[PDB]
Amino acid sequence: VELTDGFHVLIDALKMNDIDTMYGVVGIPITNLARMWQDDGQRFYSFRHEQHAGYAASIAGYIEGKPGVCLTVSAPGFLNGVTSLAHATTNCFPMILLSGSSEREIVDLQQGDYEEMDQMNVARPHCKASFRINSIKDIPIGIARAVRTAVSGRPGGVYVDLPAKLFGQTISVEEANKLLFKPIDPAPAQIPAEDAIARAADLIKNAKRPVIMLGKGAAYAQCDDEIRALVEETGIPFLPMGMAKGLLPDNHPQSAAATRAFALAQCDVCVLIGARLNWLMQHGKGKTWGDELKKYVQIDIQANEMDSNQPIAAPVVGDIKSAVSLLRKALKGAPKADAEWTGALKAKVDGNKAKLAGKMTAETPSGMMNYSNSLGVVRDFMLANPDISLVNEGANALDNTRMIVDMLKPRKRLDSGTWGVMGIGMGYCVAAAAVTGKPVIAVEGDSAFGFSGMELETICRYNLPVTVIIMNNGGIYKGNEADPQPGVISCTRLTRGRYDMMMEAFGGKGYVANTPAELKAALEEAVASGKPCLINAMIDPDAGVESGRIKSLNVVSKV
Amino acid sequence: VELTDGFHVLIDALKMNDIDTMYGVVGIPITNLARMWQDDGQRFYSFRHEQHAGYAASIAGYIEGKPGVCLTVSAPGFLNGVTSLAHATTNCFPMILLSGSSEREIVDLQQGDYEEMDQMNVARPHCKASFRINSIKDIPIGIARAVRTAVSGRPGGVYVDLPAKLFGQTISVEEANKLLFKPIDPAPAQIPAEDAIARAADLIKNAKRPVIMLGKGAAYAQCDDEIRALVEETGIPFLPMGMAKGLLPDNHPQSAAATRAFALAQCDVCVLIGARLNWLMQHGKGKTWGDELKKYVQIDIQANEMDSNQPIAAPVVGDIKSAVSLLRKALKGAPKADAEWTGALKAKVDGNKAKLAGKMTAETPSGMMNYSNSLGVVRDFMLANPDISLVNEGANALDNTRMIVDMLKPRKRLDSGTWGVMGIGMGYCVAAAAVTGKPVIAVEGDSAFGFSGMELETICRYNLPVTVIIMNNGGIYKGNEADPQPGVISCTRLTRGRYDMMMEAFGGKGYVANTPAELKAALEEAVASGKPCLINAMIDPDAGVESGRIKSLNVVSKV
Amino acid sequence: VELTDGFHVLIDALKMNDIDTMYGVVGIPITNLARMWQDDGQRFYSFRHEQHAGYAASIAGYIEGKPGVCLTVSAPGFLNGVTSLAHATTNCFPMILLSGSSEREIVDLQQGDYEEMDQMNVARPHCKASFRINSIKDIPIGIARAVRTAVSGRPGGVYVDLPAKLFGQTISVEEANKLLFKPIDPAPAQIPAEDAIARAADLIKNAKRPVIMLGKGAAYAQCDDEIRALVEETGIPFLPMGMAKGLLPDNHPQSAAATRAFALAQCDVCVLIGARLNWLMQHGKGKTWGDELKKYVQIDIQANEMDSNQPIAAPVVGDIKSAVSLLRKALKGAPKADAEWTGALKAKVDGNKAKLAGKMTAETPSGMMNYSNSLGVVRDFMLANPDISLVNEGANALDNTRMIVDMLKPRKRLDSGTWGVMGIGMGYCVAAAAVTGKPVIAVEGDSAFGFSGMELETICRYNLPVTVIIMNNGGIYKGNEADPQPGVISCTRLTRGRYDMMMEAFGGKGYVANTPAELKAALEEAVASGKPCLINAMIDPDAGVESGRIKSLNVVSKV
Ligand SMILES: CC(C)(COP(=O)(O)OP(=O)(O)OC[C@H]1O[C@@H](n2cnc3c(N)ncnc32)[C@H](O)[C@@H]1OP(=O)(O)O)[C@@H](O)C(=O)NCCC(=O)NCCSC(=O)C(=O)O
Ligand SMILES: CC(C)(COP(=O)(O)OP(=O)(O)OC[C@H]1O[C@@H](n2cnc3c(N)ncnc32)[C@H](O)[C@@H]1OP(=O)(O)O)[C@@H](O)C(=O)NCCC(=O)NCCSC(=O)C(=O)O
Ligand SMILES: CC(C)(COP(=O)(O)OP(=O)(O)OC[C@H]1O[C@@H](n2cnc3c(N)ncnc32)[C@H](O)[C@@H]1OP(=O)(O)O)[C@@H](O)C(=O)NCCC(=O)NCCSC(=O)C(=O)O
Ligand SMILES: Nc1ncnc2c1ncn2[C@@H]1O[C@H](COP(=O)(O)OP(=O)(O)O)[C@@H](O)[C@H]1O
Ligand SMILES: Nc1ncnc2c1ncn2[C@@H]1O[C@H](COP(=O)(O)OP(=O)(O)O)[C@@H](O)[C@H]1O
Ligand SMILES: Nc1ncnc2c1ncn2[C@@H]1O[C@H](COP(=O)(O)OP(=O)(O)O)[C@@H](O)[C@H]1O
Ligand SMILES: Cc1ncc(Cc2csc(CCOP(=O)(O)OP(=O)(O)O)c2C)c(N)n1
Ligand SMILES: Cc1ncc(Cc2csc(CCOP(=O)(O)OP(=O)(O)O)c2C)c(N)n1
Ligand SMILES: Cc1ncc(Cc2csc(CCOP(=O)(O)OP(=O)(O)O)c2C)c(N)n1
Ligand SMILES: [Mg+2]
Ligand SMILES: [Mg+2]
Ligand SMILES: [Mg+2]
Nearest CA among C64, C74, C68 for reference residue C26: C74
Single-letter code of the amino acid located at B214:
L
Residue A168 and residue A135 in contact, taking contact as beta carbons nearer than 8 Å:
no
User: DSSP secondary structure string, A389-422?
Assistant: EEEEESSHHHHHHHHHS---STT-EEESTTTT-T
State whether residue B118 sits within 8 Å of chain C by CB: yes
Whether the ω angle into residue C186 lies within 30 degrees of 0, i.e. cis, is no
The total number of structural domains in chain C stands at 3
Residue A309 and residue A289 in contact, taking contact as beta carbons nearer than 8 Å:
no
**Of the partner residues C104, C110, C141, the one whose CB lies closest to the CB of residue B109:** C141
Residue C141 and residue C99 in contact, taking contact as beta carbons nearer than 8 Å:
no
Q: Do C407 and C540 sit in the same domain of this protein?
A: yes
The alpha carbon of B465 is separated from its chain's Cα centroid by a whole number of angstroms, namely 19
Q: Do B338 and B405 sit in the same domain of this protein?
A: no
C-alpha neighbours within 13 Å on the C-beta side of residue C445: 34
Q: How far apart are CA A539 and CA A134, in angstroms?
A: 54
Q: Is C220's C-beta closer than 6 angstroms to any atom of ligand 6?
A: yes
User: DSSP secondary structure string, C276-307?
Assistant: -SSGGGGGG-SGGGTTS--EEEEEES-GGGTT
* Helical spans, DSSP H, in B42-183: 50-64, 75-91, 104-108, 119-122, 139-151, 173-179
Residue B102 and residue B116 in contact, taking contact as beta carbons nearer than 8 Å:
yes
State whether residue A498 sits within 8 Å of chain B by CB: yes
> Which among B102, B104, B105, B109 is the top mutation candidate for probing chain C, defined by the most C β-carbons within 10 Å of its own β-carbon?
B109
| Burial annotation C416-448 (CB, 10 A radius, 16+ → b, else e) | bbbebbbbbbbbbbbbbbbbbeebbbbbbbbbb
Q: How far apart are CA C81 and CA C25, in angstroms?
A: 10
Residue B238 and residue B256 in contact, taking contact as beta carbons nearer than 8 Å:
yes
In sequence order, the 6+-apart residues with CB closer than 8 A to the CB of A396 are A371, A445, A471, A473, A477, A543, A544, A545, A548
- As a 3-state breakdown, chain A gives helix, strand, coil percent values, each rounded to 5, of 45, 15, 35
Strand order, beta sheet including B440-445: B413-415, B389-393, B440-445, B466-472, B533-538, B509-513
Backbone phi, then psi, for A21, in 5-degree steps?
-145, 135
User: DSSP secondary structure string, B284-312?
Assistant: G-SGGGTTS--EEEEEES-GGGTTSSS--
Q: How far apart are CA C105 and CA B161, in angstroms?
A: 12
C-alpha neighbours within 13 Å on the C-beta side of residue B386: 14
Q: Do A89 and A184 sit in the same domain of this protein?
A: yes
Bridge partners of residue C3, in order along the sequence? C172
Q: Do B110 and B258 sit in the same domain of this protein?
A: no
Ligand closest to C303 (CA) is 6
Q: Candidates C58, C248, C300: which one to mutate for ligand 6, based on the most atoms within 8 Å of Cβ? A: C300
Q: How far apart are CA A5 and CA B24, in angstroms?
A: 45
Q: Do B407 and B427 sit in the same domain of this protein?
A: yes
Backbone phi, then psi, for B334, in 5-degree steps?
-75, 150
Q: What is residue C259's three-state secondary structure?
A: helix
Single-letter code of the amino acid located at C206:
N
User: DSSP secondary structure string, B118-157?
Assistant: -HHHHTGGGSSEEEE--SGGGHHHHHHHHHHHHHSSS--E
CA distances B208 to B237, B297, B339, B340, B466, Å, are: 12, 14, 10, 9, 46
Q: How far apart are CA B337 and CA C544, in angstroms?
A: 70
Reduce the secondary structure of C124-176 to three states and give it as a string.
HHHCCEEEECCCHHHHHHHHHHHHHHHHCCCCCEEEEEEEHHHCCCEEEHHHH
Q: How far apart are CA B80 and CA A82, in angstroms?
A: 10
Nearest CA among A392, A397, A391, A393 for reference residue A370: A397
State whether residue A461 sits within 8 Å of chain C by CB: no
In sequence order, the 6+-apart residues with CB closer than 8 A to the CB of C242 are C216, C280, C402, C413, C415, C416, C417
In sequence order, the 6+-apart residues with CB closer than 8 A to the CB of C128 are C89, C149, C150, C153, C154, C156, C157, C158
User: DSSP secondary structure string, C85-120?
Assistant: HHHHHHHT--EEEEEEE--HHHHHTTS--TT---HH
Give, to the nearest 10 degrees, the angle between helix C75-91 and helix C50-64. 30
- How would you classify the pairing of strands A3-5 and C68-72? unpaired
Q: How far apart are CA A473 and CA A537, in angstroms?
A: 8
Bridge partners of residue A68, in order along the sequence? A95
- Rg of chain B's alpha carbons, rounded to an integer? 25
The enclosing domain of A372 has a CATH number of 3.40.50.970
Strand order, beta sheet including C129-132: C43-46, C21-24, C68-72, C95-101, C157-163, C129-132
Q: Candidates B128, B154, B306, B309: which one to mutate for ligand 5, based on the most atoms within 8 Å of Cβ? A: B154
Which DSSP category does C479 fall into?
Answer: S
Q: Do B12 and B158 sit in the same domain of this protein?
A: yes
Resolution in A: 2.1
Residue B137 neighbours by CB distance under 10 Å: 18
Residue C344 neighbours by CB distance under 10 Å: 18
- How would you classify the pairing of strands C95-101 and C413-415? unpaired
Nearest Cα residue in chain C from B141: C109
The enclosing domain of C296 has a CATH number of 3.40.50.1220
Q: Do C103 and C180 sit in the same domain of this protein?
A: yes
Q: Do C29 and C166 sit in the same domain of this protein?
A: yes
Among the three residues A347, A382, A407, which one is the final residue of a domain in this structure? A347
User: Which residues on B lie below 8 Å from A115 (Cβ)?
Assistant: 419-420
Residue A363 neighbours by CB distance under 10 Å: 7
* Helical spans, DSSP H, in A235-276: 260-266
- In terms of phi and psi (left: phi > 0; alpha: psi -120 to 50; beta: otherwise), the region of B417 is left
In sequence order, the 6+-apart residues with CB closer than 8 A to the CB of B231 are B212, B238, B248, B252, B254
Residue C150 and residue C157 in contact, taking contact as beta carbons nearer than 8 Å:
yes
Q: How far apart are CA A192 and CA A299, in angstroms?
A: 9
Q: Do C172 and C218 sit in the same domain of this protein?
A: no
Residue A165 neighbours by CB distance under 10 Å: 18
Q: How far apart are CA C422 and CA C83, in angstroms?
A: 12
Backbone phi, then psi, for A223, in 5-degree steps?
-135, 60
Q: How far apart are CA A473 and CA B198, in angstroms?
A: 67
Q: Do B302 and B284 sit in the same domain of this protein?
A: yes
Q: How far apart are CA B274 and CA B282, in angstroms?
A: 16
Backbone phi, then psi, for A132, in 5-degree steps?
-135, 135
Whether the ω angle into residue A188 lies within 30 degrees of 0, i.e. cis, is no
Bridge partners of residue A99, in order along the sequence? A72, A161
| Burial annotation C29-66 (CB, 10 A radius, 16+ → b, else e) | bbeebbebbeeeeeebbebbbbbbbbbbbbbbbbbbbb
Among the three residues B313, B347, B381, which one is the final residue of a domain in this structure? B347
Q: How far apart are CA C78 and CA C55, in angstroms?
A: 13
Nearest CA among C162, C270, C155 for reference residue C209: C270
- As a 3-state breakdown, chain C gives helix, strand, coil percent values, each rounded to 5, of 45, 20, 35
Q: What is residue A378's three-state secondary structure?
A: helix
Q: What is residue B269's three-state secondary structure?
A: strand
Which DSSP category does C318 fall into?
Answer: S
- Rg of chain C's alpha carbons, rounded to an integer? 25
Compute the CA torsion angle B378, B382, B385, B386 (nearest 10 deg). 160
Helices and strands (H, E) in chain A, number of each type: 22, 19
User: Counting beta carbons within 10 angstroms of the beta carbon of residue A195, is it exposed (0 to 12), middle (13 to 18) or buried (19 or more)?
Assistant: exposed
State whether residue B109 sits within 8 Å of chain C by CB: yes
Interface touch B553/A28, C-beta < 8 Å: yes
Q: Is C280's C-beta closer than 6 angstroms to any atom of ligand 6?
A: yes
Residue C297 and residue C270 in contact, taking contact as beta carbons nearer than 8 Å:
yes
Nearest CA among C224, C216, C218, C153 for reference residue C190: C153
Reduce the secondary structure of C15-72 to three states and give it as a string.
HHCCCCEEEECCCCCCHHHHHHHHHHCCEEEECCCHHHHHHHHHHHHHHHCCCEEEEE
> Residue B395 annotated as binding?
yes
Identify each DSSP E strand in B320-423 by its residue range: 389-393, 413-415
- How would you classify the pairing of strands C533-538 and B466-472? unpaired
* Helical spans, DSSP H, in B157-297: 173-179, 194-206, 216-220, 224-234, 260-266
Residue A528 neighbours by CB distance under 10 Å: 12
Handedness of CA A228, A232, A233, A234 (dihedral sign): positive
- Rg of chain A's alpha carbons, rounded to an integer? 25
Nearest Cα residue in chain B from C104: B134
Residue C547 neighbours by CB distance under 10 Å: 16
Bridge partners of residue C488, in order along the sequence? C485
Strand order, beta sheet including C295-300: C238-240, C211-214, C269-273, C295-300, C314-317
Structural domain of B397: 348-559
Query: Which helix (DSSP H) or strand (DSSP E) does residue A157 occupy?
Result: strand A157-163
| Burial annotation B515-530 (CB, 10 A radius, 16+ → b, else e) | bbebbbebbeebbeee
How was this structure determined? It was done by: X-ray
Residues in chain C: 559
Strand order, beta sheet including A238-240: A238-240, A211-214, A269-273, A295-300, A314-317
Residue A451 neighbours by CB distance under 10 Å: 32
Q: Do A12 and A134 sit in the same domain of this protein?
A: yes
In sequence order, the 6+-apart residues with CB closer than 8 A to the CB of B6 are B136, B139, B166, B167, B168, B169, B170
Q: How far apart are CA B55 and CA B421, in angstroms?
A: 10
Among the three residues C135, C154, C188, which one is the final residue of a domain in this structure? C188
Residue A476 and residue A554 in contact, taking contact as beta carbons nearer than 8 Å:
no
Residues in chain B preceding a C-to-N separation beyond 2.5 angstroms (breaks): none
Strand order, beta sheet including A509-513: A413-415, A389-393, A440-445, A466-472, A533-538, A509-513
Single-letter code of the amino acid located at C47:
F
Residue C273 and residue C315 in contact, taking contact as beta carbons nearer than 8 Å:
no
Residue A545 and residue A554 in contact, taking contact as beta carbons nearer than 8 Å:
no
Interface touch C315/A190, C-beta < 8 Å: no
Q: Do A222 and A139 sit in the same domain of this protein?
A: no
Compute the CA torsion angle B401, B403, B404, B408 (nearest 10 deg). 100
Ligand closest to C417 (CA) is 6
Q: How far apart are CA B406 and CA B246, in angstroms?
A: 7
